[PDB]
Design an enzyme around this catalytic site. Sequence first.
Site, PDB file in Angstrom:
ATOM      1  N   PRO A 108      27.579  55.147  38.372  1.00 52.12           N
ATOM      2  CA  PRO A 108      26.528  56.358  38.454  1.00 52.12           C
ATOM      3  C   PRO A 108      25.130  55.886  37.756  1.00 52.12           C
ATOM      4  CG  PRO A 108      28.775  57.210  37.395  1.00 52.12           C
ATOM      5  CD  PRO A 108      28.686  55.822  37.581  1.00 52.12           C
ATOM      6  N   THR A 334      53.897  10.407  28.113  1.00 51.28           N
ATOM      7  CA  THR A 334      54.214  10.736  29.389  1.00 51.28           C
ATOM      8  C   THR A 334      55.322   9.594  30.012  1.00 51.28           C
ATOM      9  OG1 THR A 334      52.334  12.217  29.769  1.00 51.28           O
ATOM     10  CG2 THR A 334      53.437  11.379  31.592  1.00 51.28           C
ATOM     11  N   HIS A 684      40.502  19.472  28.900  1.00 50.52           N
ATOM     12  CA  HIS A 684      40.535  19.686  27.418  1.00 50.52           C
ATOM     13  C   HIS A 684      39.843  21.470  27.456  1.00 50.52           C
ATOM     14  CE1 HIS A 684      40.796  15.553  26.364  1.00 50.52           C
ATOM     15  NE2 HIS A 684      41.957  15.985  26.605  1.00 50.52           N
TER      16      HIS A 684
END
Length: 736
Positions: A108, A334, A684
């Site tokens: 509106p 890893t 990151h």
Amino acid sequence: SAKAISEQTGKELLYKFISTTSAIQNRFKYARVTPDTDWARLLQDHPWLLSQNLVVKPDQLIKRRGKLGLVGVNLTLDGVKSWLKPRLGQEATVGKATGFLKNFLIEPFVPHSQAEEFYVCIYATREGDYVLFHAQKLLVGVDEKLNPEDIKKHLLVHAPEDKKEILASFISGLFNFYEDLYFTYLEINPLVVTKDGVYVLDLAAKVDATADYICKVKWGDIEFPPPFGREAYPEEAYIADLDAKSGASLKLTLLNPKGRIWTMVAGGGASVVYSDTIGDLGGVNELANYGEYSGAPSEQQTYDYAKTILSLMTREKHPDGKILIIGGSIANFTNVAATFKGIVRAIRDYQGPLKEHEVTIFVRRGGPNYQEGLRVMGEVGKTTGIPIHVFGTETHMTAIVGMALGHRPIGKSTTLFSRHTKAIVWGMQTRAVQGMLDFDYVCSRDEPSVAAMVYPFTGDHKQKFYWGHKEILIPVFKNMADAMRKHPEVDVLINFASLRSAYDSTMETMNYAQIRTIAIIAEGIPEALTRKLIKKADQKGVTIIGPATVGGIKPGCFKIGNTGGMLDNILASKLYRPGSVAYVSRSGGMSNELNNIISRTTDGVYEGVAIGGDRYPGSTFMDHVLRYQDTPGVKMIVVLGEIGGTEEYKICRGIKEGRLTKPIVCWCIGTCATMFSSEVQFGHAGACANQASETAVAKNQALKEAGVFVPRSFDELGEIIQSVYEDLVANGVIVP
Ligand code: NA
């Protein structure tokens, strides 16, 4: 990472959950317009569309929609349909970005005076959250509350006394809503306050996406839209789902699905560096993706990540074929064999499409079991006939980029650790502790660095370990209180808690003054909780390394958890005895690259710290640079900076004030971020630039002008480190 949300989503959350006694007008009076809208349903569901004048605008993370003429103002519903006909589905350009106007929001129209518009903004910093109003600025500290009387006294000094009570009430509600739902940015411009109440005419916001596990209920199925200029793709959501179901990190952003340069790089830091290199060789327009995997994902998780890439790069043919860059630093943690076995499995299952699309693969990797990883990666090339060029640690990390692109294939404590450091490890991390003991042994330490472990989900017991070849027992405690009272000699705690329990376990640790240094390993802690960790750490004088870090290493003395990897890396990079070179980086994987780089060009690493990738690290670059300045054994300092924030400038001011006098080599990664038409957020969570000063390019220039030794690119970092070293050797400052 903090992520923006649409104006509709933010108003949705605000209308549902703001707790205020103020009257918020036009609540739930909005209507979303897409090229697929059922306009009959729209009028049925939002009947106010037919009985008052409206405002229409795109809701696609475009700011200054007024100045851009993208706002139909005070129109009837028929006028809205007409305003939309030339615009809906048509291209538009905002700055560098170009994209389709496809998502609109009708609301509106609010007749109001110019004087009834107000500006309100809440945004997060390390020291707390600032509230802007007009410009009046008020800081709400970490763990403090916003007294509505504090709003009246500082924000509303120049405000009419009649409007002063509804403003303070709304702002108090808005701030608690901001905090409860883990916002990091919330802007309302303008906020309209008339005699009838408060209207939210515009809303831009970002939320801390890592707080999902806290805010799930109230956020609902929250939508994080791409920046204007780019599209969202189902493969990104698929990878994000893998990321949620794994402690390892898995991220993927599509930049150009048709581009011929594809990357599958390990590490948030390293993947930014490969992108930087690609950008420096003119390949930005052909760069298809940014992404990374880190935190030791499983063979299966890596297979699912890799197969998403291989499918995405075999959707259509490029006349010159395509190239896949499977790179990474010399990993700390890893498993290279396990992860490359998963990529190999994916390559194998897509060998047809890969040969069909003329894909050439370039591989560079080090880390645990990297020889096996490189072998199986060459094996799959021979059995499939896919050209795969494989390289190891002897090859510079970014060297495969030039190969691939040069042509188209035809003040707190100064000393944290010593040889005598004794640590408690929180969590069940037998392999990490054993890796530390192996390092302690080849360093010729008298005793193991791990005195005890704490894990409250099992009972008190001993744990067998190897000290050299002999076998030993290390006590494991259920209650931290027991581990502390029986080992007052411990002053380090390495917290391997998951992201969900890392906050409470770290706050508990800081009830024990005997602990002076805390390493927080977990990635994914909400930034607002880390700020509380920083507040308590600062109050207690405790040094925090992390979060979102592998830790760091002090050769000959101590290494945090998995930092530095297996014995073969400890030996190759000469990390069993100290040198003269200290370094601090954000990236944990790149820190082990620096271990190798510094090992080959100097007498070795003296101390290395990875402060982590989060927006508010427990300890900053300046904190550790200062420690190195005040450490006599340190003769030169290497800083691997990063786009985002202004931390690197403190190094400049320190030189200018005479506090820092030893030679400083610094390179800030992320130079390619400015080459993109849209913004891109790297692996990151803190690698996000708002201002021009927060860019890696701007910081590199500033650093260089202040007397820092800055290479031209990351490729020359090893060169300038060797060169600064030999000067110090020549001047007698370093004697090996
Ligand atoms: Na994850």
